[PDB]
Design a protein around this nucleic acid. Structure first.
Ligand SMILES: [Mg+2]
Ligand SMILES: [Mg+2]
Lengths: 419, 469, 469, 419
DNA sequence: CTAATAGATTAGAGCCGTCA
RNA sequence: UGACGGCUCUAAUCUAUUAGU
DNA sequence: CTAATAGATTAGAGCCGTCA
RNA sequence: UGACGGCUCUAAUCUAUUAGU
């Protein structure tokens, strides 16, 4: 014998039956059950009868609402009754009542006069009672070892729960910067430009630094705002190459690597802002940064390459937006993040932070990875100019190019996505 | 086209020397390491709260099923799992008349009423502990909803006592520090979520499918506060000490006086795990500076090293000081001055505000849990939140962000640092979950920082984590 | 010729509502009132002490048999009696090196060496209570016999250290009042009595035939100190609260002065016994004046009345003041000024000085325990010690002295006062005996006073008894 | 047929059923009941019927508010009645009532004509009742243990042992005062006696008080030490009868009823000291009082009326000693306190406190009530004067009479002295 | 010392969803 | 505050420069 | 205020048996 | 101090009175 049969309502009583099987195996009891094994097929009933008749010592029946009046369960009950009659064993079938709804009045006739082990109140009490009954009846057993139960858990519970050594491809939000100008400029206007001219109003990016103006533009560029510009010699311009200041190989008492890199980042940010302003795209003011969004109906049927960017929710319209930041670490990038904004009808914004935040929280519940990926890629591809690039004007002839496809990452380990 | 590597699951050790990858499965299959015999509970509040707790205790005694047996594991019962009894018969009850709450919650000034309510609870708790012959292990407080609603700092009602914070929970835990009494606080609405509704006929919070998770969390917290050791890490290498430092502001003071708190973890040479907060609040009077003065840094490092020496017998061979901020040169020099000879000092920074997301193009499921991107020899991007093959779901809803781990000061291997940071996230005892987004050493310290800041009278505060979470 | 009257014994209330006259059989049949789950023991001391403690804990599991069953009942095992678990598996050890103990007892000054030993022993307990995670129910200190013989008031070896009484036990229990930690002190000879011997091959203390009583005593002590109630009085008359006062001299504090401490008992709602102290010494500058000034007496009565009012909600119908001094008109006029009109104050005096003795004619055993001789309406002799037919022996040798009860103030019946004093002798939780020779109100107050006056002033001392005895 | 059946209402009476079953098992009986013996997986009705019918010598029924009107209890009662009819044993069913809320007029119809055993007062009394019934009915007891089951049986039968009603006579250590002198007097010596004569050293008891001397002696007495006494008018005296002094009556500005009952006590103590000095009895100085003892051999073979007062213990000789104190509360009596002193050679004491204490403690082990009583009585009888009285000298003629037998007390409660 | 302009750090709050 | 996640609205500080010191 | 004579009370310390 | 009891030794204090303060 040396084996203990367990029957249940597959798959309604998986929890208790599987827990009891693992527990009993962990204590050194040989337990035979259906869901425990994985291989199945036509030859699944002859083995049941042979095991019950030949090498089964105790029959435990998980009697619940589902397990009662079950054809397979009743067949197992009949076979167990025959085996019990043959073996002259008074105690061979043991009911285990795990359902509170299953009253003792409406139980099956095959088990109506038998003393049942109750599990409704506390499962540990029932486990202790089963152990005591097995000990009193001298059920054969081995030494208690939880290693067998752990092995069964590892090899059955986690069969299709492992990890797959499959290569994959990842899209990101990192856009690489392709082109840079040749040199940087610190035009020297010795008390030539107005003291408080507000140089952040010029048609080209510029930053004040000592008495110098830093810009990628030409020496005589932006002369419309500075009429007193032509009478200026070329020798008074400090030209610094871009490659060395991006590589950190230019240290001067005039300026160090840190401040020059900071100025380059500032110029990139201002150029991005001005260029996006040129595209005629609506603006949104966040807590610290600024976002850009399209109106409703700006595109053809509110779609671009079969991907919708503007939509209707209840009595408002929702707009997808992207925000960019010019950063030089680890490699020159223009990092991109996503946001959602809400307007009354698609043309005018609603002046309420709480409403916007609550609406975004409600909207983002049902969106998944594919939705964000498609929207981000579509809005990035909207901006690009000719085939693969997007240019920012840093001067009369200088341009900075950003690619429209994000940087990919290659990984070697993935999953089997089992629904 | 960069390259990513994979980091394997930490293993959390369980009873009888068997290992697993999920805390819930190990608890429900084998049992805890130590064996507490019983838990005696003390309930404070109105008769409604006592009935609520009694009903909840009677309810949690039997298995509760969730929506999905694979997504969130089941709850096979408190006693059937923890091998201990926590029921509604050893309850010791202390009432608070509703007129007292009414006569107290009318001042309309948050500080005075917060102090008054905290006093009205703690005085009875202390008196019961002092002048009664029973033995209460864990003290449960059923906080009424109307008390909770208006005790928030920036909330409105539609000098002697001003040296305190404007929060009920913080101050309530703070003034019980010197009496060494473990305390658990339950919202009245949380325990009985069904009877509290809105003008729609539905509960404000729907716990229908997630009662199993709630039961797991509450049972684990109550077991840990009662002196239990549920699970421990598997392969912590000998001779490594982790020490996290967290900075905080102070509500009222002549100066901002930024406060510093610390938390400590290492191996106990007895195949255990020592995880305790080594905190004596250090102070910096300078405004906005999040670097300790040299004397404070010397004191902190000396105290931590001495604690390690007394607990084991020798100085550590490796000290990873996790912090959320970069260190300046003078602080690192001061750390070096109080350092032994054969002791490697490493300063690591963990940050979250770094815009970077990765999208899976084929499916609609997020990235794997254990992936990692190595930028250089001194930094990396580590993933901890996302899809796990064991639980068949993602730890978050949207596309999660990864963590940026930087070896700011000293020499260390980035892969080993990432492995340790990932393995540290399976020891959050305040909840029973598969994984978290932040390591425990920089998390529990935060809680310490928000307890012993609400009051200034505490000298030599307790260290064990059973009085802070 | 004079006559002697007899009073029967007030039996107590064990489990299931059962009643019995002797504590041993009362516990052996029905068990304690409350049911503990198990006792976790923490041990502080050396390695030999830990080994001996584990050996004794193992030995007290199996039945232990006495020489004479009629005089002393057997010990059938701790689990079979108290229905809880106390095994050598939840034992937690903290080592105190023999080097420290040896080096501290070398200053040749009793005060300094006692201070050093007490500080050494209590620092580890405070650290293990405030910093560690485990749970300790009762701390069992195991002191070596070589320090007990030297920590005595008048002991000779063959800085805020002079402000404490030169006794180890008193100061040890006095210094831990502010941290609320139970403690049980053992001498190494008390447990391992067979190993300690004398010039002859016999132990100094012979427990061969009284081993069962030793087991019963230690078992009941550990049961009470872990939060158990072994028994309670069967009948306590309603509306009546009983007091007990003891005077203790504050030795060597800037002057010869004295203080007073109290204990009280009453029956509260729910048929429970509120058996609790009344703390806070009340002094008087005069030396040798075993009395109280009016200001301190009014405070004492107000405190007792308010303490009863808080629990019951009604002013007591009757108040009894057991004491071993005699009141004067000044302090009794200080009384009755805060005493309610629906309250009667009876001031009763109990003493054992007047030398009367009774011998039975043509016999060999002594007089019974229930006999009493009433001289007047305001005087009585009560034989609280004597022969007990139930155990077929006497509680003392030779002829015991009678106990003098004198109603010093108030009007009442002598029979009722004698009955109450006889009943107040069945509440010796520290022991497992038939009855005690003096009322517990006059002994537990003395135990309190011996501890409160062996240290500096401490505010609001604990009122429970498990922290003192 | 050696098994006892217990019928109850599961789970309403589990506690008492388990308690009685455990007690009976510890006694040595074989007990079958539901909760104690509940096999799992067996037909419970058939097993219960087989147990009741084949092997059952007694049927213990538990009757209470719960077990009344129960289907299983009634069926077991019916089968037990059938077995009783088939066995012809009129004491087969034994009811046991454990509920105070169950009236005797509402019992089951099947047990109305049966003698029940009341468990209301105490489970011990009912247990002893049922054990007495079993012993009377000769219930087979399976004794498989020695010195443990017998000790369990001997433990009970002793808690109910109590006192019996019988008058007893006790002796005491109080000697009643029989008579007093009629007058006490305050002789007026107007600064006649020396200022520091130290009056306590003369022959008769006297006490100084203001300019007066208080003594029971006559006016012209004690002239041997105060010769200048004859020239003294006898009218210069204040006389108050002693009978009214010992009545709480006399009070005056000269002396208050209080200082009175102190002066008389002092005079009695001084008279006792002088009288015991006159009897040639050796003395010992204790911490506070003074004791008197007899030398070795001064009695005939150290015995007085078949009682021994001086004995031998190893290298020491023990002597019985008494100390006297005169008290007036409640009535004039002389209190005698016993002591045991030790001498080296029977004539010289030892000037060491430790050895005296140790020797007395060693001597106190063997003595019992009879020894102490006989020794005190013999000592007092030796101190007697003529037949039953003993006088103390207060002056020339006045004397105080005290009995030589202690006050006898009588009681109504005693014990049987069960050896 | 204070007041504008940028980057790169940090810390406090409050709000919504967790299933189908 | 039984957890965890992701958002929006706010404040100091450091560096660089200019002008009020 | 100091010092002796007593009665009448109160508090501390120190030591030994517990069975046959 | 694992309990209990019984003895022994010291030291204040109150009261009455007496004498120098
Ligand atoms: Mg908590
Ligand atoms: Mg004790």
């Amino acid at each position: 014998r040396n084996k203990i049969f367990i029957s249940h309502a597959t798959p309604d009583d998986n929890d208790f039956t599987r827990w009891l099987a693992l527990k009993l195996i962990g204590l050194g009891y040989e337990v035979w059950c259906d869901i425990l094994f994985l291989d199945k097929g036509v030859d699944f009933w002859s083995n049941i009868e042979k095991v019950i008749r030949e090498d089964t010592c105790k029959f435990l029946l998980v009697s619940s609402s589902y397990s009662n009046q079950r054809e397979g369960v009743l067949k197992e009950l009949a076979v167990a009754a025959k085996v019990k009659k043959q073996l002259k064993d008074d105690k061979f079938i043991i009911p285990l009542a795990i359902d509170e709804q299953l009253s003792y009045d409406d139980i099956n006739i095959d088990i109506v006069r038998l003393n049942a082990i109750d599990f409704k109140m506390s499962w540990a009490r029932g486990l202790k009672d089963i152990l005591e009954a097995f000990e009193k009846q001298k059920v054969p057993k081995e030494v208690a070892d939880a290693s067998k139960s752990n092995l069964l858990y590892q090899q059955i519970f986690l069969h299709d729960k492992s990890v797959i050594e499959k290569e994959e491809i990842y899209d990101s939000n990192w856009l690489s910067i392709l082109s840079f100008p040749e040199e940087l400029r610190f035009h020297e206007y010795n008390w030539m430009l107005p003291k408080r001219f507000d140089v952040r109003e010029l048609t080209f990016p510029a930053v004040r630094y000592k008495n110098y103006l830093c810009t990628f533009a030409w020496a005589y560029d932006f002369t419309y705002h500075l009429p007193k510009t032509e009478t200026y010699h070329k020798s008074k311009t400090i030209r610094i190459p871009t490659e060395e200041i991006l590589s950190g190989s230019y240290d001067s008492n005039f300026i160090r690597n840190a401040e020059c890199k900071r100025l380059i980042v500032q110029l990139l940010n201002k150029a991005f802002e001005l260029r996006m302003k040129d595209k005629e795209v609506q603006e949104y003011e966040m807590s610290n940064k600024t976002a850009y969004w399209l109106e409703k109906g700006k595109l053809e049927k509110d779609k671009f390459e079969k991907t919708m960017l503007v939509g209707k929710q209840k009595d408002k319209n929702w707009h997808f937006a992207i925000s960019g930041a010019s950063k030089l670490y680890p490699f020159p990038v223009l990092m991109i993040s996503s946001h959602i904004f809400f307007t009354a009808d698609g043309k005018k914004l609603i002046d309420s932070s709480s409403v916007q935040h609550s609406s975004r929280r409600r909207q983002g519940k049902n969106w998944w990875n594919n939705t964000w990926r498609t929207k981000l890629l579509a809005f990035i591809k909207y901006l690009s100019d000719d085939d693969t690039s997007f240019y920012l004007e840093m001067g009369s002839e200088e341009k900075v190019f950003v690619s429209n496809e994000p940087v990919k990452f290659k990984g070697n380990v993935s999953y089997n996505i089992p629904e | 086209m960069k390259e990513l590597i994979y980091i394997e699951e930490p293993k959390i050790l369980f009873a009888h020397g068997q290992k697993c990858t999920d805390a819930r499965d190990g608890l429900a299959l084998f049992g805890p390491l130590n064996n507490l015999y019983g838990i005696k509970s003390g309930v404070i509040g109105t008769k409604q709260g006592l009935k609520i707790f009694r009903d909840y205790l009677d309810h949690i005694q039997k298995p509760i099923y969730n929506s999905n047996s694979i997504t969130r594991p089941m709850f096979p019962g408190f006693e059937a799992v923890f091998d201990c009894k926590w029921e509604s018969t050893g309850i010791t009850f202390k009432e608070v008349t509703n007129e007292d709450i009414g006569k107290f919650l009318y001042n309309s000034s948050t500080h005075k009423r917060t102090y008054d309510l905290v006093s009205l609870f703690i005085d009875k708790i202390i008196s019961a502990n002092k002048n009664e012959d029973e033995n209460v292990d864990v003290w449960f407080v059923i906080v009424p909803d109307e008390i909770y609603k208006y005790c928030r700092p920036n909330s409105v009602l539609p000098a002697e006592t001003y040296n305190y914070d404007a929060q009920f929970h913080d101050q309530f835990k703070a003034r019980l520090l010197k009496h060494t009494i473990p305390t658990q606080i339950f919202r009245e609405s949380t325990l009985a979520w069904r009877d509290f509704k809105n003008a729609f006929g539905l509960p404000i919070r729907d716990f229908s499918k997630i009662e199993g998770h709630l039961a797991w969390t509450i049972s684990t917290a109550a077991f840990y506060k009662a002196g239990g050791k549920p699970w421990k890490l598997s392969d912590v290498r000998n001779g490594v000490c982790y020490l996290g430092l967290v900075y905080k502001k102070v509500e009222k003071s002549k100066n901002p006086r930024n406060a510093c708190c610390a938390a400590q973890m290492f191996l106990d040479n007895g195949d255990g795990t020592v995880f305790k907060g080594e905190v004596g609040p250090w102070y910096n009077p300078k405004n906005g500076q999040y670097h300790l003065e040299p004397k404070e840094a010397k004191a902190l490092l000396s105290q931590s090293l001495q604690s390690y020496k007394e607990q084991i017998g020798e100085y550590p061979k490796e000290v990873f000081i996790h912090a959320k901020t970069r260190f300046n040169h003078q602080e690192w020099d001061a750390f070096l001055e109080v350092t032994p000879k054969e002791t490697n000092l490493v300063g690591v920074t963990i940050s979250k505000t770094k815009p970077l997301k990765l999208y899976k193009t084929e499916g609609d499921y997020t990235i794997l849990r254990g992936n990692a991107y190595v930028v250089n020899e001194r930094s990396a991007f580590l993933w901890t939140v996302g899809y796990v093959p064991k639980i068949q779901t993602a730890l978050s809803m949207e596309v999660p962000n990864p963590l940026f781990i930087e070896i700011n000061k000293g020499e260390a291997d980035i892969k080993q640092v990432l492995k340790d940071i990932l393995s540290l996230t399976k020891l959050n005892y305040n909840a029973c979950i598969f994984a978290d987004g932040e390591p425990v050493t920089l998390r529990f310290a935060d809680k310490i920082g928000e307890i012993l800041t609400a009051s200034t009278d505490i000298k030599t505060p307790p260290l064990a984590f059973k009085y802070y979470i």
